[PDB]
């Protein structure tokens, strides 16, 4: 769907994108296809005191693997670094905002409420904006964003 990292990626400076290229072009030496498989992620982890099992490693990759390649490509590696970038809403808090969306108190945020709310903001809400958010929110696609989705949906949102 979408992410607080994906945006962070588009956000990297042209000077930023470069060093990760190098870091990446090195991370792949001795790799046939030019992608990061376990054998490569293993090599580096090991320079960092770690020594994950293939499994623990393959799993480190699937969290970033977007084309089912089973290996990390630049863009993916790109995301992976954003993710690993650095750390800085509480459930209790979001539980309260979700309430502010749910205007009919049915315990579900629906299109109408989303739009209403969506309009509350100054920004010119387009027809695409709407269809898209409601698209990332409704990961189940039942017409309404449920509490849990609203959670994963607003996840990471400053």
């Amino acid at each position: 769907m979408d992410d607080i990292y994906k945006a962070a990626v588009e956000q990297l400076t042209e000077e930023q994108k470069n060093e990760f290229k190098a870091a990446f072009d090195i991370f792949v030496l001795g790799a046939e296809d030019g992608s990061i498989s376990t054998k490569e992620l293993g090599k580096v982890m090991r320079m960092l005191g770690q020594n994950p099992t293939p499994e623990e490693l393959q799993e480190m990759i699937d969290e970033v693997d977007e084309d089912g390649s089973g290996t990390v490509d630049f863009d993916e590696f790109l995301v992976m670094m954003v993710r690993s970038m650095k750390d800085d809403k509480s459930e209790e808090e979001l539980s309260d905002l979700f309430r502010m969306f749910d205007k009919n108190a049915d315990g579900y945020i629906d299109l109408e409420e989303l739009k209403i709310m969506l309009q509350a903001t100054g920004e010119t809400i387009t027809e695409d904006d709407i269809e898209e958010l409601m698209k990332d929110g409704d990961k189940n696609n039942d017409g309404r964003i449920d509490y849990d989705e609203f959670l994963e949906f607003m996840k990471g949102v400053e």
Partner: protein, 118 residues
């Protein structure tokens, strides 16, 4: 194997960062709205007391009236408190049921590892 998206991902963030900014803000309003419903509602139950004009039998009978109410109200308050309590349990109980149904690496450490001194 998977595919790409419809609108700029950086924007989606900005709306998300805004839907909240408002809600958070719309909460503050529901809140300032409550504090106001408290005063006006207390002004209805807890009417203002104008002793200035009362006499003795007036002042006493009222003091008796009040002393008498204090107990009635402290009881009303207990009953609700009673329930709000049962709910903390309730809420924390269901909160459990749902719960039942449902390594480490830094960026700069990695870059350090790959590029060397940068």
């Amino acid at each position: 194997a998977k595919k790409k998206s419809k609108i700029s991902a950086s924007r989606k963030l900005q709306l998300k960062t805004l839907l909240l900014q408002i809600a958070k803000q719309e909460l503050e309003r529901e809140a300032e709205e409550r504090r106001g419903e408290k005063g006006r509602a207390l002004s209805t139950r807890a009417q203002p007391l104008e002793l200035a004009g009362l006499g003795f039998a007036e002042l006493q009978d009222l003091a008796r009236q009040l002393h008498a109410r204090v107990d009635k109200v402290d009881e009303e308050r207990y009953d609700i408190e009673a329930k709000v309590t049962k709910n903390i349990t309730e809420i924390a109980d269901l909160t459990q049921k749902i719960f039942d149904l449902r390594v480490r690496i830094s960026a700069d450490a990695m870059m350090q590892a790959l590029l060397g001194a940068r």
